[PDB]
Design an enzyme around this catalytic site. Structure first.
Site, PDB file in Angstrom:
ATOM      1  N   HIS A 127      -6.986   9.575  -2.788  1.00 34.91           N
ATOM      2  CA  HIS A 127      -6.496   9.633  -1.417  1.00 34.91           C
ATOM      3  C   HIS A 127      -7.420  10.337  -0.423  1.00 34.91           C
ATOM      4  O   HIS A 127      -7.618   9.851   0.692  1.00 34.91           O
ATOM      5  CB  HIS A 127      -5.100  10.269  -1.400  1.00 34.91           C
ATOM      6  CG  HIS A 127      -4.231   9.797  -0.275  1.00 34.91           C
ATOM      7  ND1 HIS A 127      -2.854   9.890  -0.311  1.00 34.91           N
ATOM      8  CD2 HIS A 127      -4.538   9.237   0.920  1.00 34.91           C
ATOM      9  CE1 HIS A 127      -2.352   9.407   0.813  1.00 34.91           C
ATOM     10  NE2 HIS A 127      -3.353   9.005   1.577  1.00 34.91           N
ATOM     11  N   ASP A 143       0.823  -1.186   0.000  1.00 32.44           N
ATOM     12  CA  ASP A 143       0.000   0.000   0.000  1.00 32.44           C
ATOM     13  C   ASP A 143       0.863   1.245   0.000  1.00 32.44           C
ATOM     14  O   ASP A 143       1.471   1.588   1.014  1.00 32.44           O
ATOM     15  CB  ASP A 143      -0.905   0.008   1.222  1.00 32.44           C
ATOM     16  CG  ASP A 143      -1.951   1.088   1.146  1.00 32.44           C
ATOM     17  OD1 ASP A 143      -3.017   0.846   0.539  1.00 32.44           O
ATOM     18  OD2 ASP A 143      -1.694   2.184   1.679  1.00 32.44           O
ATOM     19  N   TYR A 170       3.534   9.672  -0.140  1.00 31.37           N
ATOM     20  CA  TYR A 170       4.524   9.029   0.734  1.00 31.37           C
ATOM     21  C   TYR A 170       5.959   9.292   0.248  1.00 31.37           C
ATOM     22  O   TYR A 170       6.931   8.936   0.917  1.00 31.37           O
ATOM     23  CB  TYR A 170       4.271   7.513   0.822  1.00 31.37           C
ATOM     24  CG  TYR A 170       2.908   7.123   1.376  1.00 31.37           C
ATOM     25  CD1 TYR A 170       2.084   8.065   1.997  1.00 31.37           C
ATOM     26  CD2 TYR A 170       2.429   5.813   1.257  1.00 31.37           C
ATOM     27  CE1 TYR A 170       0.820   7.720   2.479  1.00 31.37           C
ATOM     28  CE2 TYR A 170       1.162   5.454   1.738  1.00 31.37           C
ATOM     29  CZ  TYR A 170       0.363   6.419   2.346  1.00 31.37           C
ATOM     30  OH  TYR A 170      -0.903   6.103   2.795  1.00 31.37           O
ATOM     31  N   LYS A 199      -2.212   6.032  -4.533  1.00 26.22           N
ATOM     32  CA  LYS A 199      -3.290   6.981  -4.304  1.00 26.22           C
ATOM     33  C   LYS A 199      -2.991   8.333  -4.943  1.00 26.22           C
ATOM     34  O   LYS A 199      -1.862   8.829  -4.891  1.00 26.22           O
ATOM     35  CB  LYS A 199      -3.504   7.182  -2.799  1.00 26.22           C
ATOM     36  CG  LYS A 199      -3.505   5.899  -1.972  1.00 26.22           C
ATOM     37  CD  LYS A 199      -3.773   6.196  -0.501  1.00 26.22           C
ATOM     38  CE  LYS A 199      -3.668   4.934   0.357  1.00 26.22           C
ATOM     39  NZ  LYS A 199      -2.264   4.450   0.455  1.00 26.22           N
TER      40      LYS A 199
HETATM   41  N1  LIG Z   1      -5.254   6.277   3.080  1.00 32.32           N
HETATM   42  C1  LIG Z   1      -4.900   6.825   4.213  1.00 32.32           C
HETATM   43  O1  LIG Z   1      -5.363   7.877   4.597  1.00 32.32           O
HETATM   44  C2  LIG Z   1      -3.867   6.160   5.125  1.00 32.32           C
HETATM   45  C3  LIG Z   1      -3.494   6.797   6.389  1.00 32.32           C
HETATM   46  C4  LIG Z   1      -2.530   6.148   7.209  1.00 32.32           C
HETATM   47  C5  LIG Z   1      -1.934   4.918   6.815  1.00 32.32           C
HETATM   48  N2  LIG Z   1      -2.341   4.344   5.556  1.00 32.32           N
HETATM   49  C6  LIG Z   1      -1.672   3.069   5.126  1.00 32.32           C
HETATM   50  O2  LIG Z   1      -1.949   1.980   6.072  1.00 32.32           O
HETATM   51  C7  LIG Z   1      -0.724   1.556   6.727  1.00 32.32           C
HETATM   52  C8  LIG Z   1      -0.922   1.385   8.213  1.00 32.32           C
HETATM   53  O3  LIG Z   1      -0.591   2.634   8.890  1.00 32.32           O
HETATM   54  P1  LIG Z   1       0.653   2.694   9.859  1.00 32.32           P
HETATM   55  O4  LIG Z   1       1.831   2.269   9.108  1.00 32.32           O
HETATM   56  O5  LIG Z   1       0.732   3.994  10.570  1.00 32.32           O
HETATM   57  O6  LIG Z   1       0.274   1.661  10.987  1.00 32.32           O
HETATM   58  P2  LIG Z   1       0.696   0.184  11.308  1.00 32.32           P
HETATM   59  O7  LIG Z   1       1.212  -0.354   9.999  1.00 32.32           O
HETATM   60  O8  LIG Z   1      -0.330  -0.376  12.077  1.00 32.32           O
HETATM   61  O9  LIG Z   1       2.023   0.382  12.221  1.00 32.32           O
HETATM   62  C9  LIG Z   1       1.989   1.363  13.264  1.00 32.32           C
HETATM   63  C10 LIG Z   1       3.075   1.114  14.376  1.00 32.32           C
HETATM   64  O10 LIG Z   1       2.962  -0.194  15.039  1.00 32.32           O
HETATM   65  C11 LIG Z   1       4.213  -0.840  15.165  1.00 32.32           C
HETATM   66  N3  LIG Z   1       3.941  -2.208  14.792  1.00 32.32           N
HETATM   67  C12 LIG Z   1       3.777  -2.813  13.563  1.00 32.32           C
HETATM   68  N4  LIG Z   1       3.532  -4.109  13.627  1.00 32.32           N
HETATM   69  C13 LIG Z   1       3.536  -4.359  14.997  1.00 32.32           C
HETATM   70  C14 LIG Z   1       3.331  -5.564  15.697  1.00 32.32           C
HETATM   71  N5  LIG Z   1       3.072  -6.771  15.175  1.00 32.32           N
HETATM   72  N6  LIG Z   1       3.397  -5.509  17.092  1.00 32.32           N
HETATM   73  C15 LIG Z   1       3.658  -4.300  17.755  1.00 32.32           C
HETATM   74  N7  LIG Z   1       3.862  -3.101  17.091  1.00 32.32           N
HETATM   75  C16 LIG Z   1       3.794  -3.183  15.713  1.00 32.32           C
HETATM   76  C17 LIG Z   1       5.190  -0.108  14.193  1.00 32.32           C
HETATM   77  O11 LIG Z   1       6.504  -0.043  14.754  1.00 32.32           O
HETATM   78  P3  LIG Z   1       7.826  -0.800  14.157  1.00 32.32           P
HETATM   79  O12 LIG Z   1       7.764  -0.438  12.706  1.00 32.32           O
HETATM   80  O13 LIG Z   1       9.008  -0.233  14.922  1.00 32.32           O
HETATM   81  O14 LIG Z   1       7.637  -2.305  14.426  1.00 32.32           O
HETATM   82  C18 LIG Z   1       4.566   1.261  13.995  1.00 32.32           C
HETATM   83  O15 LIG Z   1       5.053   2.201  14.953  1.00 32.32           O
HETATM   84  C19 LIG Z   1       0.372   2.573   6.227  1.00 32.32           C
HETATM   85  O16 LIG Z   1       1.662   1.993   6.043  1.00 32.32           O
HETATM   86  C20 LIG Z   1      -0.206   3.156   4.952  1.00 32.32           C
HETATM   87  O17 LIG Z   1       0.193   2.462   3.791  1.00 32.32           O
HETATM   88  C21 LIG Z   1      -3.298   4.957   4.718  1.00 32.32           C
END
Ligand SMILES: NC(=O)c1ccc[n+]([C@@H]2O[C@H](COP(=O)([O-])OP(=O)(O)OC[C@H]3O[C@@H](n4cnc5c(N)ncnc54)[C@H](OP(=O)(O)O)[C@@H]3O)[C@@H](O)[C@H]2O)c1
Ligand SMILES: NC(=O)c1ccc[n+]([C@@H]2O[C@H](COP(=O)([O-])OP(=O)(O)OC[C@H]3O[C@@H](n4cnc5c(N)ncnc54)[C@H](O)[C@@H]3O)[C@@H](O)[C@H]2O)c1
Lengths: 319, 319
Positions: A111, A44, A49, A78
């Site tokens: 987006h 994604d 980004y 997006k």
């Molecule tokens: N369309 C939109 O508006 C929008 C907005 C926001 C995000 N997104 C997309 O959705 C994705 C998710 O958002 P995100 O990256 O902020 O959140 P996430 O992927 O849930 O990760 C958030 C945090 O959790 C930690 N983490 C990841 N896996 C973990 C696990 N198994 N156990 C404990 N901690 C864990 C990571 O730290 P570490 O990396 O240090 O492990 C990171 O600080 C993004 O990469 C992006 O592509 C889309």
């Protein structure tokens, strides 16, 4: 194995992907590459980004080594806010196609239902909140449907396999379904126990629209705008409901949060810089939450939103 | 005495009006006539209310007696859901003009951002939830903007002085502002202490759009309809916060509930169903609420919505 979801477009989309937001440019390539080796097939990304070129490097390397074929990788990008004016949609999609080094993207989402004043790629890329006049926000009068039709043409031209929307509230999604020829195949929205929006999910799923969740860890997820709001929020990882359910199945709070969505037909796209978490984030479908578990988690919904344009310039998307 | 509000269209609109929803046909004319004698000049009606002919009778009577002239009366009507298709908009408006017995309506609003399948006026009028197939709901693919342009035409044709929308969330209003030539002059939405939506109000007002609140008394209007949600909700008339403030200024809770909207530049159209109420509901601007008062009343906001299409057929208008 990562179950697939058949989109309304007929194409299959992995139910679990690798979030690319905040992936450092210097390591993005290696990370996507490793993710592919670990089994991830959906990535994604987003023009905003600023690392699509590097995400592409990682993908190209996996292909060049014969790890996977382009047909096996699902790429989501997006359209950023400055590119809603129809005459700028293709130019933006092209920049994305070049950066990723591919002929087409599997999924291209609007987006945000927000149209910023166009800013040339050469002037600043990605533009972020820059609209061509210092720190001032400037918008364009471009209805969503105009942008959507532009996208529809691009699908006909073979440059996009499926199209969808992100951060679209229910009323807006409905109106789009009225003037759309190609129905939005996906709706990507913030989704976690503090912002469950059950009625939005149900409406969309019944309309045949697939849900892709982001910020699955609520405040534990990465938060850039109004970091304070997230920091001052009791973590989901330490919440008693999540803690109890996690302990009950001997799973981590993260696995419970991801499965809570997966079991409900919602796609997830976790992002981790730690190889151990990377594997766990795609191996959580080894148990099922019970009716009671779902009922207990449902009590957490408080409509707490961390990604809100109201914070940018009081943009009324979610009001 | 009743303050006027200059709409974006340049026309004045009384800040206090007479609601015509659930105004019995048998006595609607007499009541409208009486309201006019009591000083009311704006009447908020709708094709769906099925009493526009009677409302028309009351206005005509007051005019024939020389109590008022057509130009002193402000008539608001609303395009019902089955008439969103451009080819049927003027048809529906002509029905309204014929029943009201006037050459134009002062305000014509899109009643709901919902488009039911067209039902000929001769088959059933008003149609209500009837969509031409038994008790089933049937919709037609008609984008809001299409309906809005049909309306803009009618404005140029002199059949409507001002146009606006009702029950539009922020995202939808924003998008409409992107493609509208004549800016929606009015946003009419459910507004009371239990559903304040301060961000929608702020955005709309800052956009030059005038807000008209409906159901200023919260659940009362729906209790009279035997709605479970409203019946289970403590009335605002007996709420401790409302009564305390009322006592503080030696006013009635009813007056505080209307002033709370009026003081912030919001128009009200209370449903006066008793002679005593006719007077009470148009003579409340006799005191000012303090910042403290607003902060206290602000605590009642809980997002409790009484008029919700989600109840009819899971229509995602407010999700
Ligand atoms: N369309 C939109 O508006 C929008 C907005 C926001 C995000 N997104 C997309 O959705 C994705 C998710 O958002 P995100 O990256 O902020 O959140 P996430 O992927 O849930 O990760 C958030 C945090 O959790 C930690 N983490 C990841 N896996 C973990 C696990 N198994 N156990 C404990 N901690 C864990 C990571 O730290 P570490 O990396 O240090 O492990 C990171 O600080 C993004 O990469 C992006 O592509 C889309
Ligand atoms: N566009 C829309 O979707 C929509 C929906 C509902 C109503 N409206 C309009 O707005 C108007 C007002 O809303 P409403 O009619 O639902 O409710 P309201 O809040 O105006 O009044 C509801 C009820 O409270 C009581 N009441 C009125 N004045 C009172 C007073 N001084 N003291 C004690 N009780 C009093 C009456 O019994 C009345 O039926 C309607 O008549 C209609 O024109 C529009």
């Amino acid at each position: 194995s990562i179950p697939d979801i058949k989109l309304s477009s007929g194409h299959l989309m992995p139910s679990i992907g690798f979030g690319c937001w905040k992936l450092a440019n210097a390591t993005a390539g290696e990370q996507v590459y490793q993710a592919i080796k670990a089994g991830y097939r959906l990535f994604d990304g987003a023009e905003d980004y600023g690392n699509e070129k590097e995400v592409g490097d990682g993908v190209k390397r996996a292909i060049d080594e014969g790890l996977v074929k382009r047909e096996e990788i699902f790429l989501t990008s997006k359209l950023w806010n400055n590119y809603h004016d129809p005459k700028n949609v293709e130019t933006a999609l092209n920049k994305t196609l070049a950066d990723l080094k591919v002929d087409y993207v599997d999924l291209f989402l609007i987006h945000f239902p927000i149209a910023f004043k166009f800013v040339p790629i050469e002037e600043k890329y990605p533009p972020g909140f820059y609209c061509g006049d210092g720190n001032n926000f400037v918008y364009e009068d471009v209805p969503i449907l105009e942008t959507w039709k532009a996208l529809e043409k691009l699908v006909a031209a073979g440059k996009i396999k499926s199209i969808g929307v992100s951060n679209f509230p229910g009323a807006l999604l409905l109106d789009l379904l009225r003037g759309a020829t190609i129905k939005p195949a996906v709706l990507q929205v913030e989704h976690h126990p503090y912002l469950q929006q059950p009625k939005l999910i149900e409406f969309a799923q019944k309309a045949g629209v697939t849900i892709t969740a982001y910020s699955s860890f609520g405040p534990q997820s990465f938060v850039e705008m109004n970091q304070g709001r997230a920091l001052n929020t009791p973590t989901l990882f330490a919440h008693d409901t999540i803690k109890a359910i996690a302990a009950k199945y001997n799973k981590t709070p993260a696995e419970v949060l991801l499965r809570w969505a997966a079991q409900r037909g919602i796609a997830v796209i976790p992002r981790s810089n730690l190889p151990e978490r990377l594997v766990q984030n795609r191996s959580f479908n080894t148990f099922d939450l019970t009716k009671e578990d779902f009922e207990e988690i449902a009590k957490l919904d408080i409509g707490l939103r961390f990604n809100d344009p109201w914070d940018w310039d009081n943009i009324p998307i979610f009001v």
